[PDB]
């Protein structure tokens, strides 16, 4: 959660991640040649949970 300067006042944000976009990006980067990272910092149990 962050604070954004809307006008002269402030708004509170509740940032959420888009996992379907992440999966699509993973597929497209799999079938591509752009430099990329794997980021295997996860386990099967955690991903299940």
């Amino acid at each position: 959660q962050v604070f954004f300067p809307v006008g002269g006042s402030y708004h509170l944000l509740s940032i959420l991640p888009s996992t379907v976009l992440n999966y699509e990006v993973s597929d497209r980067l799999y079938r591509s040649k752009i430099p990329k990272i794997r980021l295997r910092l996860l386990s099967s149990n955690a991903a299940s949970t």
Binding site: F3, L12, L13, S14, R38, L39
Partner: protein, 254 residues
């Protein structure tokens, strides 16, 4: 009495570097939030100024991890100490996605308001020691200077917005356009530039501060490029400033 203040060679360690689908340069919203926090810290003090427009000049970078023999990057994370909630008493803790980066960069702030002089630089120097940049920790700095000429900017590569290259590519959805535009030009990199809106303004049970307006957001991604300081066109065409619309909190150049 408008002017420009340059913070020279600021070193940041363990800065956050993991957006949803981006690893590397942190989001521009982090730098703008740092500038806003600096302005708020000064305004809470006796010196009253205002900051509009920030320019970033990269000098060095280093991702936290190592490089494979195949050329890929493998990122490292600190050992998770303890996590609140369930299973908070066991020695070993769960590991989520994270990345970190060290970077040494210079900042250019377009500051406006009364009493813009060397006293303002001294105040910013005194009050900048209790701040963080994108979750990182400031360690050292070269100096703070008052700059009105473009020729005084040291050597470095600025970061601008190149959404035209994104919009000038084939493909129906802009993911294909972004991928194709990245294939044409190796300089272009994807960066996060703001947040969209996924709900309506309201109040919920449990938040950082139950007085402001709550709104669930998403991460907004675009393209960007690196331009040398010696071949920069103009001072004004390198700044990053806020932009507010109907749930379209964003950072741009203008």
């Amino acid at each position: 009495m408008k002017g420009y203040i340059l913070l020279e060679k600021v070193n940041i360690e363990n800065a956050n570097a993991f957006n949803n689908i981006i690893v590397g340069i942190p989001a521009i919203t982090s730098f703008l939030g740092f500038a806003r926090a600096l302005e708020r810290k000064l305004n809470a003090k006796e010196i009253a100024i205002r900051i509009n427009g920030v320019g970033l000049e990269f000098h060095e970078y280093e991702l936290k991890g190592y490089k494979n023999k195949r050329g890929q990057y493998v990122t490292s994370c600190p050992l998770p100490g303890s996590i609140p909630g369930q299973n908070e008493k066991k020695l070993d803790a769960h590991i989520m996605n994270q990345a970190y980066i060290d970077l040494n960069m210079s900042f250019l702030l377009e500051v406006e308001g009364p009493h813009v002089d060397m006293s303002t630089c001294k105040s910013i120097k005194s009050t900048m020691e209790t701040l963080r940049i994108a979750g990182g920790i400031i360690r050292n700095y070269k100096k703070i200077r008052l700059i009105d000429t473009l020729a005084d900017i040291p050597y470095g590569y600025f970061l601008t917005l190149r959404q035209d290259n994104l919009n000038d590519a084939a493909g129906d959805d802009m993911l294909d356009k972004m991928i194709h535009a990245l294939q044409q030009e190796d300089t272009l990199v994807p960066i996060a530039v703001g947040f969209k809106a996924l709900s309506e303004v309201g109040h919920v049970e449990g938040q950082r501060d139950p007085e402001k307006d709550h709104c669930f957001v998403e991460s907004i991604f675009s393209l960007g490029g690196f331009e040398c300081s010696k071949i920069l066109e103009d001072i004004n065409s390198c700044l990053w400033r806020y932009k507010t619309e109907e749930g379209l909190y964003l950072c741009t150049i203008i």
